[PDB]
Amino acid sequence: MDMKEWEIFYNKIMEDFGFDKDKDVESAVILNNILENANTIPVDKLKDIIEGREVFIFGAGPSIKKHINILKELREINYKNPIIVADGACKAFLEENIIPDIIVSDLDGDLEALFECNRKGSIIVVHAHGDNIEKIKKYVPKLKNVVGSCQIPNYKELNLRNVINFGGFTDGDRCCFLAYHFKAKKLILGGMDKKLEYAKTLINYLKDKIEIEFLK
């Protein structure tokens, strides 16, 4: 029921897995520096897209392609809600001719799917962590409609004004923490399967403050 208790959790994760907290902050400084003169998105356009609505958050589960056709059919009831996809799942929507409204990505995958969705109108939420430094340095200048994310809790005292961090460890949960923060009503998750044990923990935490109904 706090976010500087997330600063505590950040510490438990980094020491748990053994992540260089210093490569973490470094990628956030590189990211904010790049986004000062980049094809960004007024972060308040994501409030229009999310606030009050009933967003869909898609990961990369064993149920990805048979949850997406559910999305297909629900869409032709004049029922179309903002969609958020976790990293590489966008190739699933590119393969079903669905274009995600927002993609939270740390660039870790093959970027062929992500890039084609970007030019088609996606909002790409780039998230900075330790190992994606050179990727952020190369691929963020090649994108449009980009929003910067980072793992470090202490991002506002470091003068990172082109970055926001709304909580979350896996790129999947950041979507919901983004969905929570932008005042979404309920989240309908799809394609949900070590790191996963923390995802369920944070998802459980979101179950209390926001309505969260996994689809099946």
Side-chain angles (χ1 to χ4, degrees), residues 61-72:
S63 324
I64 181 64
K65 310 227 144 240
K66 284 326 139 183
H67 264 281
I68 184 46
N69 96 323
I70 305 169
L71 244 182
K72 266 179 180 234

Side-chain angles (χ1 to χ4, degrees), residues 24-207:
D24 219 348
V25 50
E26 180 198 9
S27 41
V29 197
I30 300 173
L31 182 102
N32 196 56
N33 268 27
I34 307 205
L35 265 75
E36 179 76 65
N37 34 58
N39 278 320
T40 78
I41 280 271
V43 85
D44 274 344
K45 178 63 230 181
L46 302 118
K47 200 182 80 167
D48 313 45
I49 299 264
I50 278 174
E51 215 212 6
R53 297 267 312 180
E54 46 268 71
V55 312
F56 281 81
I57 300 132
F58 273 65
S63 324
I64 181 64
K65 310 227 144 240
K66 284 326 139 183
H67 264 281
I68 184 46
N69 96 323
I70 305 169
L71 244 182
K72 266 179 180 234
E73 170 218 74
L74 170 150
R75 185 229 197 292
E76 305 305 17
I77 306 186
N78 192 359
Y79 209 54
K80 178 99 210 151
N81 296 307
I83 312 107
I84 318 194
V85 137
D87 269 299
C90 44
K91 154 262 211 193
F93 291 31
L94 206 55
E95 271 179 350
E96 313 275 304
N97 209 328
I98 308 204
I99 289 303
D101 282 23
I102 289 146
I103 318 194
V104 162
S105 178
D106 71 40
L107 324 181
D108 67 80
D110 183 335
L111 300 314
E112 62 164 317
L114 201 143
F115 264 108
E116 233 295 335
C117 293
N118 185 233
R119 54 201 55 131
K120 276 284 111 202
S122 300
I123 283 196
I124 309 304
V125 169
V126 198
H127 160 86
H129 61 92
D131 39 342
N132 66 346
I133 308 204
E134 283 321 317
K135 281 225 191 247
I136 294 166
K137 273 166 83 119
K138 170 160 201 220
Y139 286 131
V140 173
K142 313 218 188 185
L143 286 171
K144 187 211 181 209
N145 288 154
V146 313
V147 177
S149 208
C150 78
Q151 263 179 15
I152 74 154
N154 40 5
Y155 80 89
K156 308 222 246 153
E157 323 72 16
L158 299 208
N159 266 68
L160 266 44
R161 295 137 307 145
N162 297 267
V163 185
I164 49 87
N165 168 23
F166 293 139
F169 164 55
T170 326
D171 260 11
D173 323 318
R174 323 202 59 89
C175 289
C176 320
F177 283 96
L178 181 74
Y180 174 99
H181 170 267
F182 272 131
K183 322 191 216 150
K185 284 302 141 263
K186 51 179 105 178
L187 325 180
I188 325 182
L189 303 319
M192 291 315 218
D193 323 288
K194 257 158 204 182
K195 54 282 181 193
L196 299 210
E197 322 158 313
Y198 268 99
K200 179 261 304 151
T201 286
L202 297 143
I203 288 324
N204 284 26
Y205 178 77
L206 266 188
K207 268 184 247 169

